[PDB]
Amino acid sequence: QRTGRSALAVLIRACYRLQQQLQRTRRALLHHSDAVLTSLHHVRMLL
């Protein structure tokens, strides 16, 4: 009973967190990349 039910919990903790790791890379690469577009629009404001 404890052999098959706990060995799958290895792959439970892996799959539900890889769903979470790619969500931060959606956010942290848009809250960083918009600063680039913030900087480039600022340079045109100087001109």
Binding site: C15, S33, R44
Partner: protein, 45 residues
Amino acid sequence: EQVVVLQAQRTAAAAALENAAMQAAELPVDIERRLRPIERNVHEI
């Protein structure tokens, strides 16, 4: 006459920035284009 020369460069530099702006404004489209099917694939598991 120095005004006419430098205003020709001000409007020429504004075109290359908008070339650069529209090049890098397509990047937030891609993050929400490439990663969203990959999120769907991990949900299949």
